[PDB]
Amino acid sequence: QDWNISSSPVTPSPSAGAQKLYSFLVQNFQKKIISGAMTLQGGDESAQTKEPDWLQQNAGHRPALVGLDFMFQTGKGEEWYYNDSRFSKQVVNGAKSYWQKGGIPALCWHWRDPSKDTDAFYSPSSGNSATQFDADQAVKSGTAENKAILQDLAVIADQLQDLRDAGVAVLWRPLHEASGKWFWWGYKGADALKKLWKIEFDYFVKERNLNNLIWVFTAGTPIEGIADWYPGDDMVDVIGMDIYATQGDHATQQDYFNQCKSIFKGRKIVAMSECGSVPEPDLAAPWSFFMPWYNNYCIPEGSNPYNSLEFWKKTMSSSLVITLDNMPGW
Ligand SMILES: *[C@@]1(O[C@H]2[C@H](O)[C@@H](O)[C@H](O[C@H]3[C@H](O)[C@@H](O)[C@H](O[C@H]4[C@H](O)[C@H](O)[C@@H](O)O[C@@H]4CO)O[C@@H]3CO)O[C@@H]2CO)O[C@H](CO)[C@@H](O)[C@H](O)[C@H]1O
Ligand SMILES: OC[C@H]1O[C@@H](O[C@H]2[C@H](O)[C@H](O)[C@@H](O)O[C@@H]2CO)[C@H](O)[C@@H](O)[C@@H]1O
Ligand SMILES: [Mg+2]
Ligand SMILES: [Mg+2]
Ligand code: NA
Ligand code: NA
């Protein structure tokens, strides 16, 4: 079955930066694999680039992609972050900085309980301290939940607008891992998820004129029945998988790659939007990019690390792998 990927992103009149980023992904897809690393946001300034910095010093190159999260930008009790000058622009500045170096900012958002009754993003089926926030109500005009999500969306849009006005484009991966139902946005199932995606997509793209985003839909794990969760080809640019293999297992995850090609009819670039152990670079399973999670998921610890020093040295020197030093500059 053929690939059938659009040369333009879904956003009408994408920014110059977004079209360059999207074209870079299209032209490298199936030929090279873009290296990435997640970072941990919060009150630790020093630590904001620790994973890319470790990779530079130990493996000889920074990843081409850096991950950042708006999780503290809104939420009950998070004023220490979103009202502090040291932290209220941490995500924008991190994204700006990496873009200016020629890298790819990949943004997500562990979206805390929009009601502000709790500070939680985890759902009642997660096994963790949960929010009761009801996505089915959030997608209905005129409910308290709807008002709450629109307030939070305005705050995040303000940040993304700062990026837009600076010429920065990003991978934007909202409402992620919905199918696991462990976050409130997926907890009510596919119907509310798709309606939330549309509310956000329309608000960002149409109402706020945010033309600088490349939209990443996270298709699993779990992948079963994901077709019913898909927002549609007109609101997604990239299919991302979040696959956490056994610790130390660098299997290529070929079967998940093939499933994303089949399920989405070859219409979208396929990426490993989160992982623990990184899939071995392999053009038979050519993830557009990979992104291990932060801390020990990237920087090795112990005798069976997720990504050992020797694995990283090999991976970041491979001709298959794009590092920050291979980027053209935007
Ligand atoms: C404030 O408290 C911070 C706390 O210091 C900080 O460690 C903290 O970070 C948590 C975060 O709340 C949580 O969402 C995140 O969840 C992870 C998850 O565990 C997993 O790794 C994966 O799913 O990703 C999730 C998202 O990253 O885990 C991190 C810990 O790694 O959150 C609280 C606030 O909510 O600290 C500041 C600065 O010191 C003080 O000023 C505040 O008063 C204090 O409340
Ligand atoms: O622009 C040069 C050629 O690009 C071809 O598509 C590429 C794509 O950009 C990626 O590199 C990857 O998917 O490989 C394909 C195949 O080379 C395109 O199909 C050609 O028409 C075009 O001349
Ligand atoms: Mg549709
Ligand atoms: Mg091989
Ligand atoms: Na699965
Ligand atoms: Na090691």
Q: Cα(275) to centroid of ligand 1, in Å? A: 20
23 lines ligand 2 (CB under 6 A): no
Residue that has been written with the tokens 């996270």 in this structure: 218
Residue that has been written with the tokens 């690939």 in this structure: 3
- Which candidate in 51, 177, 207, 310 is catalytic? 177
307 phi/psi in degrees, rounded to 5: -140, 100
Q: Cα(242) to centroid of ligand 5, in Å? A: 9
Backbone Cα Rg of the chain: 19
Q: Cα(69) to centroid of ligand 1, in Å? A: 12
Write the single-letter amino acid at 221. Answer: T
Q: Cα(217) to centroid of ligand 1, in Å? A: 24
Is residue 301 part of the annotated active site? The answer reads: no
29 lines ligand 2 (CB under 6 A): yes
Name the residue with the closest Cα to ligand 1, atom 18: 110
- CATH of residue 132's domain is 3.20.20.80
Write the single-letter amino acid at 229. Answer: W
Name the residue with the closest Cα to ligand 1, atom 7: 42
126 lines ligand 1 (CB under 6 A): no
* Mutation choice for ligand 2 from 24, 31, 320, CB with most ligand atoms inside 8 A: 31
| Contact (Cβ atoms closer than 8 angstroms) between residue 63 and residue 36 | yes
Tally of CA atoms within 13 A in the half-sphere of 198 that contains its CB: 16
Tally of CA atoms within 13 A in the half-sphere of 30 that contains its CB: 11
Distance CA 43, CA 46 (A): 9
- Residue 224 burial (10 A CB sphere; 0-12, 13-18, 19+): exposed
Distance CA 59, CA 96 (A): 24
Q: Cα(27) to centroid of ligand 2, in Å? A: 6
Please tell me the number of the ligand nearest to residue 308's CA: 6
| Domain assignment of residue 235, given as a range | 1-330
| Contact (Cβ atoms closer than 8 angstroms) between residue 107 and residue 146 | no
**Long-range contacts of 254-258, Cβ-Cβ distance < 8 Å, separation of 24 or more:** 254/282, 254/284, 254/285, 256/220, 256/221, 256/223, 257/285, 257/286, 257/287, 258/285
Technique employed here was X-ray
Give the pairing of strands 321-322 and 290-292: unpaired
| Contact (Cβ atoms closer than 8 angstroms) between residue 33 and residue 26 | no
Q: Cα(300) to centroid of ligand 4, in Å? A: 23
Distance CA 6, CA 42 (A): 37
* Mutation choice for ligand 1 from 69, 71, 274, 299, CB with most ligand atoms inside 8 A: 71
- Which candidate in 51, 145, 200, 274 is catalytic? 274
Distance CA 242, CA 162 (A): 28
| Contact (Cβ atoms closer than 8 angstroms) between residue 270 and residue 205 | no
Distance CA 163, CA 99 (A): 10
Residue 183 neighbours by CB under 8 Å, 6+ apart: 110, 111, 121, 122, 123, 126, 176, 177
75 CA: nearest ligand 1 atom: 35
Residue that has been written with the tokens 């090999």 in this structure: 314
Neighbours of 213 (CB within 10 A): 27
Please tell me the number of the ligand nearest to residue 307's CA: 6
- Could you tell me which of 210, 214, 212 has the C-alpha nearest to residue 202? 210
217 is written with which tokens? Answer: 């839909």
294 CA: nearest ligand 1 atom: 21
Residues within 5 A (CB) of ion ligand 5: 221-223
Distance from the Cα of residue 258 to its chain's centroid: 20
The CA-atom distances, in angstroms, between 108 and each of 20, 170, 185, 273, 325 are: 20, 10, 13, 10, 24
Distance CA 62, CA 155 (A): 30
Name the residue with the closest Cα to ligand 1, atom 40: 80
79 lines ligand 1 (CB under 6 A): no
Write out the chain in H/E/C secondary structure: CCCCCCCCCCCCCCCHHHHHHHHHHHHHCCCCEECEEECCCCCCCHHHHHHHHHHHHHHCCCECEEEEECCCCCCCCCHHHHCCCCCCCHHHHHHHHHHHCCCEEEEECCCCCCCCCCCCCECCCCCCCCCCCCHHHHCCCCCHHHHHHHHHHHHHHHHHHHHHHCCCCEEEECCCCHHHCCEHHHHCCHHHHHHHHHHHHHHHHHHCCCCCEEEEEECCCCCCCHHHHCCCHHHCCEEEEEECCCCCCCCCCHHHHHHHHHHCCCCCEEEEEEECCCCCCCCCCCCCEEEECCHHHCCCCCCCCCCCHHHHHHHHCCCCEEEHHHCCCC
Residue that has been written with the tokens 């999260």 in this structure: 69
Distance CA 267, CA 249 (A): 29
- Overall number of domains in the chain: 1
Distance CA 76, CA 116 (A): 5
> For the chain, how long is the longest CA-to-CA vector?
55
Distance CA 251, CA 137 (A): 41
